[PDB]
Amino acid sequence: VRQKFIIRSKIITYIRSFLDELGFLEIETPMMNIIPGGAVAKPFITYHNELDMNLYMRIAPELYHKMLVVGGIDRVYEIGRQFRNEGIDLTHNPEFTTCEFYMAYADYHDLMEITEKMVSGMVKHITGSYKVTYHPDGPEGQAYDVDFTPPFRRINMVEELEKALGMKLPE
Amino acid sequence: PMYQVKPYHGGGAPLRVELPTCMYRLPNVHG
Numbered sequence: 064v065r066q067k068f069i070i071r072s073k074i075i076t077y078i079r080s081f082l083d084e085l086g087f088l089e090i091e092t093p094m095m096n097i098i099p100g101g102a103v104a105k106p107f108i109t110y111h112n113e114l115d116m117n118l119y120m121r122i123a124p125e126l127y128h129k130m131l132v133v134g135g136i137d138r139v140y141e142i143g144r145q146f147r148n149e150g151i152d153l154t155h156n157p158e159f160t161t162c163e164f165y166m167a168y169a170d171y172h173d174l175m176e177i178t179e180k181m182v183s184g185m186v187k188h189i190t191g192s193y194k195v196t197y198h199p200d201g202p203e204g205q206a207y208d209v210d211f212t213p214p215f216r217r218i219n220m221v222e223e224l225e226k227a228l229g230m231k232l233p234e
Numbered sequence: 235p236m237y238q239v240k241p242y243h244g245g246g247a248p249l250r251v252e253l254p255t256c257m258y259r260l261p262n263v264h265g
C-alpha cells in the first residue's frame with residue numbers, strides 16, 4: 064500500500080519536473096467559482112457567508128488558465144483537486160486530482176509529442192521500462208503488459224467508428 | 235586486600251552522561 068502511494072508521489076513530482084524544465088509556471092487558480100466551467104459535470108454547491116452568495120466548487124481550472132495566457136504568461140500548469148458531483152465507481156471519485164497545462168503558440172500536434180514523451184518517460188523512469196503489467200480484472204484474471212513505447216497509435220473518431228460499425232456515417 | 239569502600243559515584247552503574255543529539259534523517263524517496 065505504501066509503495067502505491069510512493070509511486071503516486073513520484074508520478075506527480077516527475078510531472079512537475081518535466082513541466083518546470085520546459086519553462087512552465089506552476090500556478091493556483093480558484094477552487095470556488097461563481098460559474099463552474101471547463102468540463103461536463105454536475106457541480107458541488109456551497110454557501111459563502113461573507114459574500115452572502117452561493118458558489119460552486121470547480122470542475123476544472125481551464126478557463127482561468129486561458130485568461131492567464133491572455134495575461135501574457137505563455138506557459139502555465141496546475142496540479143490540483145477538482146470536484147465533480149457525480150457517481151462513484153472503479154474509475155471515478157467525486158474529488159480527484161488532475162494536471163492541466165496551457166502552452167502558447169502550440170497546437171494539438173505538439174501536445175501529442177509532448178504527451179508521448181512525458182508519459183513514456185514517466186513510465187520508464189518509475190518502473191525501469193516502457194512495459195508495465197496490468198490486471199484489468201484484478202489478480203483473479205489474466206494480466207497484460209501495456210507497452211508505452213512511443214509513438215502511440217492514432218485513430219480518428221469518425222473514420223474508425225465507420226470501420227467499426229461497418230457503415231458510412233454522415234459527412 | 236584492604237577493606238572495601240564503595241565508590242563515591244554510588245556504585246550502582248557507570249556514570250552515563252546525557253550527550254548532545256541530532257535528529258535522524260530519512261532518504262528522499264524521489265532521489
Ligand SMILES: C[C@H]1CCC[C@H](C[C@H]2Cc3cc(O)cc(O)c3C(=O)O2)O1
Binds near residue numbers: 147148149154155161
Ligand atoms: C481532466 C481529465 C482529462 C481526461 C482524463 C481525466 C478524466 C477524469 C474524469 C472524472 C470524472 C469524475 O466525476 C470523477 C473522476 O474521478 C474522474 C477521473 O478520475 O478522470 O482527467
